[PDB]
């Protein structure tokens, strides 16, 4: 699709068999989701933004469908304000900015 | 133009009498610029990021050119590590997400 920006670009995602809403965020290097269980091993990591840093769990090579497009990549899990899809996955689904 | 998301989507903006690099940020409701001593009346505001809130100065009706496209709107100034173009201005320049 083509998505305009008068509202937050929230989309439905599927991950670990579960549906969630997430924010398409071209200002995020990485993908960060709200606290949840994901299968497999994770590594503790920290990520920063406005307001400073938070602790997250890094899961690698995690499948996620964003709209109906398939991605498999790094998903961080922690106390993000909102589910965020970052560039690492936006690139995988072929997402660009256009003006 | 079309901007790919392999790297941070940074572009040149012109605000007041300055050119700056700024991040085209679909994950930002508002536009937030690194500290600079802009003239004009302002109102205090607090904006939230992944790590918590920060204090900023809200300037209204500020002309700003983004990659040659003229816009005018609310610009927030404060201790952000990166200049951030938010949805408030991305809409004015006809910016979409596409995949």
């Amino acid at each position: 699709p083509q998505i305009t920006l008068w509202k937050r670009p929230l989309v439905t995602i599927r991950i670990g068999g579960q549906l969630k809403e997430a924010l398409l965020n071209t200002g995020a290097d990485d993908t960060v989701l709200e606290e949840m269980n994901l299968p497999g091993k994770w590594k503790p990591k920290m990520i920063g933004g406005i307001g400073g840093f938070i602790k997250v769990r890094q899961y690698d090579q995690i499948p996620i469908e964003i709209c109906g497009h398939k991605a498999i990549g790094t998903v961080l899990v922690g106390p993000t304000p909102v589910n965020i899809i970052g560039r690492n996955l936006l690139t995988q689904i072929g997402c660009t900015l256009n003006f | 133009p079309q901007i790919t998301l392999w790297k941070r989507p940074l572009v040149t903006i012109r605000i007041g009498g300055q050119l700056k690099e700024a991040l085209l940020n679909t994950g930002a409701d508002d536009t937030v610029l690194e500290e600079m001593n802009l003239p004009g009346k302002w109102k205090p505001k607090m904006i939230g990021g992944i790590g918590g809130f920060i204090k900023v100065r809200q300037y209204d009706q500020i002309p700003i050119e983004i990659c040659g496209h003229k816009a005018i709107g609310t610009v927030l100034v404060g201790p952000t590590p990166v200049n951030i173009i938010g949805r408030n201005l991305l809409t004015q320049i006809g910016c979409t997400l596409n995949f």
């Binding site: 965020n25 200002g27 995020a28 | -």
Partner: peptide, 9 residues
């Protein structure tokens, strides 16, 4: 790495 979410409230 960095995640520049901005909540305008």
């Amino acid at each position: 790495a960095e995640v520049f979410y901005v909540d305008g409230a």
